[PDB]
RNA sequence: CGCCGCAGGUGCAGAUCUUGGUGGUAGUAGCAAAUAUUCAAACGAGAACUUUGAAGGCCGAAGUGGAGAAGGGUUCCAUGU
């Protein structure tokens, strides 16, 4: 909603952050083993936590 | 030549005999399309928007019973299109249906 | 298909007195670049000269634009090319000894006069320059008179570019990586038909396999380097832009449409400099950048203590032998080089001449 | 022209604030120049500094 | 790459291959068994006729439901559809067929399709929501295209 | 080409509804490049966007 | 436009300025972004000009 | 891996067996609740579906309108694919 609580903004504001594509030059480091960010996640598909 | 042009009387009446009330004015235009396609010989028909106007002027389901209209082939101009010719087909106001005849038209 | 060429005679003449002035502006810098002096005075001053004196050039026809096709660019042992301190900006200080390279172009009709050159500056009477700094302007001049010599309808475009390899490995120096010539017709400076030279993998699929055409200005330029090959960024703010006049966009700024709006009146689609206006020119330039409507002419920085040289001109072609109408002040009698040149169509180039 | 904590313990509390005042204002302008493009020689300078500034503090502590 | 069945002068023979090509596999597999054999010219033709449905490709193996027409008694058949996407990779696949027997330098009409082939994809999921809270594949069934063509007048 | 912006921009400014906004037919290139609403603006007043009138509803036949 | 810490208020960012850049302030205001940086809105003084103390700090 | 001994979590068709994969069904059922679309042009490789204009309609102010609370959490807005 629109109001909310300081504590909730900023756990929002963690979730963006952290939902975003891997770096391209990560796949060419050594021993990457890495494909693509699996904990991607969409607001319509997953919902959060809270 | 292949640049005449001439006028048409489409019974539209005929055409759209017994066709549900919500598809009739669009079929009208469908059978003005191949009504086109076969007097003049051309996959490519342009209908004129104010003949457009004409089928739909009283609804989608009192279309006219008979317009008249005219065929006219011209050149496309765009060799870049397969069809070097194409109809574009007006709308010709008349105010009677009485005794008209197919005519030709000159430029 | 109606755009002017050097199919008027007319034009071949306001040419060379367009090349003529050019010259002329350079050789009153060469003569005032002595010691104590900055690289902000003699950019100003020199520019401030082509102004006023192609605003007494050409009087008779004012319907059109006289004045720069490029900016004065000063730049002495670390930069490559684009550059023009402004006033706000920390100024340099000219010594003994160093070289510096000047860029200048005037244009009339939007037809260019383009030409720079490399000179050391307070240079004793009937002396000798030597060391790795006096190689690098006399492979630079023999690549000049290499392209002045060659430059002809019927040559690839590759050849130009592999005999400046060549004559850089005789020197034992490498040309500068991404330096592009071009083929300057009417409003432009940035003609698609281009020449590279120092090429790698990706810059030679992007560059277009041309041959060249009878009745036509060129841009020669040639970018020799005793280095390695590295040029980058540190930090230093570009001055000059040139408008795209193929892109246009909304801009949402009243002070940097009036930014744009003063490229129009002054440099309407010829790179210019941030000097002519300032306060406000800097805030109207960043978001102009951001959008492509000003291409940026970057200021490239070589390692500390490295040299660089340049020398471009722009070169007529004509089927009965090519001329010039700019050439800058060199002189192969107190210039020469540790290594000479070993290869025979080197050696042959240099003796013949149109 | 880096920073090495063993001259650094010689010095005054005067002086150490000065340095950790002038290395502070370096990060924010390197900091400026990050948000505006700025070169590869000043973002990576960013760590040097932050380096010098804890190297300081260490030494006042 | 391997195909199945190398031509058997392979100077005189051009290859042309897809893959994952999301087209349904069935359709696919009758339109490919109608122009086996037919000149390259006669095949361009009759997949331009298949995409205008004045010629019909005859449903022989994958025929359950397939309606009757016409047009399929040119076959020896009843029953006959037009598959307009099936008509159209192939279409796409022929031009890249006749292009690489330009690049050979082989001329283009005198080719004849003496082999194609059309082999299952991996099958690509969907879902579908059905009655009482239940869920249920919805897959793709793509296919991969392979043909020769080989020069003969 | 996708005129969508344009005409929210310029109901906007209008203070109409996108029913009443009529972006020209023919100068489409030139609306598309107006990409902010003082350009909307200039648009409007130079006559490339035009607010139809209210459909009639007459009271004639009530009178 | 500044971004700062996301503990410092109004009479910080306030003070904060005032100190690093010289310049008088008439008010701030201040959001916190959805992404949790704290942006103020710190308005000079009618005297200062934020065109050419953009130029010095080097923002322009 | 053979031979001499030793030791087993040692032999599968089943268990509405466990897990994974794959068929026939089958190019089938189907993509049928709330009246409805049409013409021209543009962009574009490609247009029933995008955008614009022209028509014909519907919601009919207890709205398919304009705003909010809860809930969602960037879905908002430009540009591009
Ligand atoms: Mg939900
Ligand atoms: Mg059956
Ligand atoms: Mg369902
Ligand atoms: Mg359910
Ligand atoms: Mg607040
Ligand atoms: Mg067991
Ligand atoms: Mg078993
Ligand atoms: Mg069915
Ligand atoms: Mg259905
Ligand atoms: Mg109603
Ligand atoms: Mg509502
Ligand atoms: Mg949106």
Same mark, same amino acid.
């Given at each position: 909603?629109?109001?909310?609580?300081?504590?909730?903004?900023?756990?929002?504001?963690?979730?963006?952050?952290?939902?975003?594509?891997?770096?391209?030059?990560?796949?060419?480091?050594?021993?990457?083993?890495?494909?693509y960010?699996?904990?991607?996640?969409?607001?319509?598909?997953?919902?959060?936590?809270? | 030549?292949?640049?005449?042009?001439?006028?048409?009387?489409? @019974?539209?009446?005929?055409?759209?005999?017994?066709?549900?009330?919500?598809?009739?004015?669009?079929?009208?235009?469908?059978?003005?399309?191949?009504?086109?396609?076969?007097?003049?010989?051309?996959?490519?028909?342009?209908?004129?928007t104010?003949? @457009?106007?004409?089928?739909?002027?009283?609804?989608?389901?009192?279309?006219?019973?008979?317009?008249?209209?005219?065929?006219?082939?011209?050149?496309?101009?765009?060799?870049?299109?397969?069809?070097?010719?194409?109809?574009?087909?007006?709308?010709?106001?008349?105010?009677?249906?009485? @005794?008209?005849?197919?005519?030709?038209?000159?430029? | 298909?109606?755009?002017?060429?050097?199919?008027?005679?007319?034009?071949?003449?306001?040419y060379?007195?367009?090349?003529?002035?050019?010259?002329?502006?350079?050789?009153?810098?060469? $003569?005032?670049?002595?010691?104590?002096?900055?690289?902000?005075?003699?950019?100003?001053?020199?520019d401030?000269?082509?102004?006023?004196?192609?605003?007494?050039?050409?009087?008779?026809?004012?319907?059109?634009?006289?004045?720069?096709?490029?900016?004065?660019?000063?730049?002495?042992?670390?930069?490559?090319?684009?550059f023009?301190?402004?006033?706000?900006?920390?100024?340099?200080?000219?010594?003994?000894?160093?070289?510096?390279?000047?860029?200048?172009?005037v244009?009339?009709?939007?037809?260019?006069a383009?030409?720079?050159?490399?000179?050391?500056?307070?240079?004793?009477?009937?002396?000798?320059?030597?060391?790795?700094?006096?190689?690098?302007?006399?492979?630079?001049?023999?690549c000049?008179?290499?392209?002045?010599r060659?430059?002809?309808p019927?040559?690839?475009?590759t050849?130009?570019?592999?005999?400046?390899?060549?004559?850089?490995?005789?020197?034992?120096?490498?040309?500068?990586?991404?330096?592009?010539?071009?083929?300057?017709?009417?409003?432009?400076?940035?003609? $698609?038909?281009?020449?590279?030279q120092?090429?790698?993998?990706?810059?030679?699929?992007?560059?277009?396999?041309?041959?060249?055409?009878?009745?036509?200005?060129?841009?020669?330029?040639?970018?020799?380097?005793?280095?390695?090959?590295?040029?980058?960024?540190?930090?230093?703010?570009?001055?000059?832009?040139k408008?795209?006049?193929?892109?246009?966009?909304?801009?949402?700024?009243?002070?940097?449409?009036?930014?744009?709006?003063?490229?129009?009146?002054?440099?309407?689609?010829?790179?210019?400099?941030?000097?002519?206006?300032?306060?406000?020119?800097?805030?109207?330039?960043?978001?102009?950048?951001?959008?492509?409507?000003?291409?940026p002419?970057?200021?490239?920085?070589?390692?500390?203590?490295?040299?660089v040289?340049?020398?471009?001109?722009?070169?007529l072609?004509?089927?009965?032998?090519?001329?010039?109408i700019?050439?800058?002040?060199?002189?192969?009698?107190?210039?020469?080089?540790?290594? $000479?040149?070993?290869?025979?169509?080197?050696?042959?180039?240099?003796?013949?001449?149109? | 022209?880096?920073?090495?904590?063993?001259?650094?313990?010689?010095?005054?509390?005067?002086?150490?604030?000065?340095?950790?005042?002038?290395?502070?204002?370096?990060?924010?302008?390197?900091?400026?120049?990050?948000?505006?493009?700025?070169?590869?020689?000043?973002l990576?300078?960013?760590?040097?500094?932050?380096?010098?500034?804890?190297?300081?503090?260490?030494?006042?502590? | 790459?391997?195909?199945?069945?190398?031509?058997?002068?392979?100077?005189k023979?051009?290859?042309?291959?897809?893959?994952?090509?999301?087209?349904?596999?069935?359709?696919?597999?009758?339109?490919?068994?109608?122009?086996?054999?037919?000149?390259?010219?006669?095949?361009?033709?009759?997949?331009?006729?298949?995409?205008?449905?004045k010629q019909?490709?005859?449903?022989?193996?994958?025929?359950?439901?397939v309606?009757?027409?016409?047009?399929?008694?040119?076959?020896?058949?009843?029953?006959?559809?037009?598959?307009?996407?099936?008509?159209?990779?192939?279409?796409?696949?022929?031009?890249?067929?006749?292009?690489?027997?330009?690049?050979?330098?082989?001329?283009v009409?005198?080719?004849?399709?003496?082999h194609?082939?059309?082999?299952?994809?991996?099958?690509?999921?969907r879902?579908?929501?059905?009655?009482?809270?239940?869920?249920?594949?919805?897959?793709?069934?793509?296919?991969?295209?392979?043909?020769?063509?080989?020069?003969?007048? | 080409?996708?005129?969508?912006?344009?005409?929210?921009?310029?109901?906007?400014?209008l203070?109409?509804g996108?029913?009443?906004?009529?972006?020209?037919?023919?100068?489409?290139?030139?609306?598309?490049?107006?990409?902010?609403?003082?350009?909307?603006?200039?648009?409007?007043?130079?006559?490339?966007?035009?607010?139809?009138?209210?459909?009639?509803?007459?009271?004639?036949?009530?009178? | 436009?500044?971004?700062?810490?996301?503990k410092?208020?109004?009479?910080?960012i306030?003070?904060?300025?005032?100190?690093?850049?010289?310049?008088?302030?008439?008010?701030?205001?201040?959001?916190?972004?959805?992404?949790?940086?704290?942006?103020?809105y710190?308005?000079?003084?009618?005297?200062?000009?934020?065109?050419?103390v953009?130029?010095?700090?080097?923002?322009?």
């Open positions: 909603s629109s109001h909310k609580t300081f504590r909730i903004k900023r756990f929002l504001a963690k979730k963006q952050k952290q939902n975003r594509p891997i770096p391209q030059w990560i796949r060419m480091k050594t021993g990457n083993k890495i494909r960010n699996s904990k991607r996640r969409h607001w319509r598909r997953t919902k959060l936590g809270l | 030549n292949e640049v005449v042009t001439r006028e048409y009387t489409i @019974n539209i009446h005929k055409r759209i005999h017994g066709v549900g009330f919500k598809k009739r004015a669009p079929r009208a235009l469908k059978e003005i399309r191949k009504f086109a396609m076969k007097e003049m010989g051309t996959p490519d028909v342009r209908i004129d104010r003949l @457009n106007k004409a089928v739909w002027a009283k609804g989608i389901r009192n279309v006219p019973y008979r317009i008249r209209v005219r065929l006219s082939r011209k050149r496309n101009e765009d060799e870049d299109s397969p069809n070097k010719l194409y109809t574009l087909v007006t709308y010709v106001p008349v105010t009677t249906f009485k @005794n008209l005849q197919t005519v030709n038209v000159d430029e | 298909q109606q755009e002017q060429t050097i199919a008027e005679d007319l034009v071949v003449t306001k060379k007195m367009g090349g003529d002035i050019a010259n002329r502006v350079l050789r009153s810098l060469v $003569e005032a670049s002595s010691s104590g002096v900055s690289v902000l005075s003699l950019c100003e001053k020199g401030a000269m082509i102004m006023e004196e192609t605003g007494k050039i050409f009087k008779k026809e004012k319907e059109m634009k006289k004045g720069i096709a490029f900016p004065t660019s000063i730049s002495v042992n670390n930069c490559v090319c684009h023009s301190p402004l006033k706000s900006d920390q100024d340099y200080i000219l010594k003994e000894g160093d070289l510096v390279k000047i860029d200048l172009g244009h009339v009709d939007g037809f260019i383009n030409v720079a050159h490399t000179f050391v500056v307070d240079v004793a009477q009937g002396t000798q320059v030597t060391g790795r700094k006096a190689d690098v302007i006399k492979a630079a001049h023999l000049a008179e290499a392209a002045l060659l430059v002809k019927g040559n690839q475009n050849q130009v570019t592999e005999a400046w390899n060549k004559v850089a490995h005789s020197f034992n120096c490498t040309p500068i990586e991404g330096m592009l010539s071009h083929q300057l017709k009417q409003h432009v400076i940035d003609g $698609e038909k281009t020449i590279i120092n090429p790698t993998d990706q810059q030679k699929k992007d560059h277009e396999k041309a041959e060249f055409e009878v009745h036509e200005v060129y841009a020669v330029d040639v970018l020799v380097s005793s280095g390695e090959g590295k040029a980058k960024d540190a930090g230093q703010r570009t001055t000059i832009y408008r795209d006049p193929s892109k246009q966009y909304g801009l949402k700024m009243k002070t940097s449409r009036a930014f744009f709006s003063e490229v129009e009146r002054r440099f309407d689609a010829m790179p210019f400099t941030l000097r002519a206006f300032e306060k406000k020119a800097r805030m109207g330039v960043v978001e102009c950048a951001k959008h492509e409507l000003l291409q002419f970057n200021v490239l920085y070589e390692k500390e203590g490295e040299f040289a340049q020398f471009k001109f722009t070169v072609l004509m089927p009965n032998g090519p001329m010039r700019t050439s800058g002040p060199f002189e192969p009698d107190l210039y020469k080089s540790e290594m $000479e040149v070993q290869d025979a169509e080197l050696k042959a180039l240099l003796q013949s001449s149109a | 022209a880096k920073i090495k904590a063993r001259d650094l313990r010689g010095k005054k509390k005067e002086e150490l604030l000065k340095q950790l005042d002038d290395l502070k204002v370096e990060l924010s302008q390197l900091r400026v120049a990050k948000v505006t493009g700025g070169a590869a020689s000043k990576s300078k960013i760590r040097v500094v932050r380096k010098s500034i804890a190297r300081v503090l260490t030494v006042i502590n | 790459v391997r195909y199945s069945l190398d031509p058997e002068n392979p100077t023979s051009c290859k042309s291959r897809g893959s994952n090509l999301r087209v349904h596999f069935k359709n696919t597999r009758e339109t490919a068994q109608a122009i086996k054999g037919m000149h390259i010219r006669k095949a361009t033709k009759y997949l331009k006729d298949v995409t205008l449905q019909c490709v005859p449903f022989r193996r994958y025929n359950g439901g309606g009757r027409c016409a047009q399929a008694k040119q076959w020896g058949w009843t029953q006959g559809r037009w598959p307009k996407k099936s008509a159209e990779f192939l279409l796409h696949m022929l031009k890249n067929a006749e292009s690489n027997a330009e690049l050979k330098g082989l001329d009409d005198s080719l004849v399709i003496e194609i082939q059309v082999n299952k994809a991996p099958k690509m999921r879902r579908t929501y059905r009655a009482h809270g239940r869920i249920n594949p919805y897959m793709s069934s793509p296919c991969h295209i392979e043909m020769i063509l080989t020069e003969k007048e | 080409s996708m005129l969508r912006l344009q005409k929210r921009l310029a109901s906007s400014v203070r109409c996108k029913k009443k906004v009529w972006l020209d037919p023919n100068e489409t290139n030139e609306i598309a490049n107006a990409n902010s609403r003082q350009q909307i603006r200039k648009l409007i007043k130079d006559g490339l966007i035009i607010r139809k009138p209210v459909t009639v509803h007459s009271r004639a036949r009530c009178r | 436009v500044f971004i700062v810490d996301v410092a208020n109004k009479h910080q306030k003070q904060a300025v005032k100190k690093l850049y010289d310049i008088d302030v008439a008010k701030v205001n201040t959001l916190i972004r959805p992404d949790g940086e704290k942006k103020a710190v308005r000079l003084a009618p005297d200062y000009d934020a065109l050419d953009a130029n010095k700090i080097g923002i322009i």
